[PDB]
Amino acid sequence: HMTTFVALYDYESRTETDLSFKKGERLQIVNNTEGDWWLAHSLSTGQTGYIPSNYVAPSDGGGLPPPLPLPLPL
Amino acid sequence: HMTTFVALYDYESRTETDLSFKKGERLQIVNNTEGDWWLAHSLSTGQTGYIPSNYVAPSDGGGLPPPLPLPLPL
Ligand SMILES: [Zn+2]
Ligand SMILES: [Zn+2]
Q1: Which-ligand-closest: CA of A58?
Q2: What's B71's DSSP letter?
Q3: What CATH number does the domain containing B40 carry?
Q4: How many domains does chain A have?
Q5: By the 8 A CB rule, do A74 and B16 touch?
Q6: Minimum CA–CA partner of B49 in chain A
């Protein structure tokens, strides 16, 4: 199905390559091989640019868990 | 106010000191200064132990953002 992310906070663009967005906006991630800045496309504003990946979460639950942090506790 | 986290996924205990929980449980964090495993207390099961911090989210929205990922886009 169409897989999107939702913004957890507002972000104000400050460069010519980042993307502003509002809390609750739905974003399509067009690229995530760049590190912790992801190339996103807004479903509601039609703008495109880089976003901080820690400002968004997946739009749907039922995702599978991430790897556990290592080391494990005792 | 009472600050809690919510489980995003089930977690099955596998060590001597970790804590099992179910998706949707609310957890009170009693120590989060030791690394990415946090000492938690279940509101519903009354159990206590270490949880993987990437399996939980804050219960409340409207917390403040994390600092912007390190390097930048220009
Ligand atoms: Zn799909
Ligand atoms: Zn409070």
Answers
A1: 1
A2: S
A3: 2.30.30.40
A4: 1
A5: yes
A6: A73
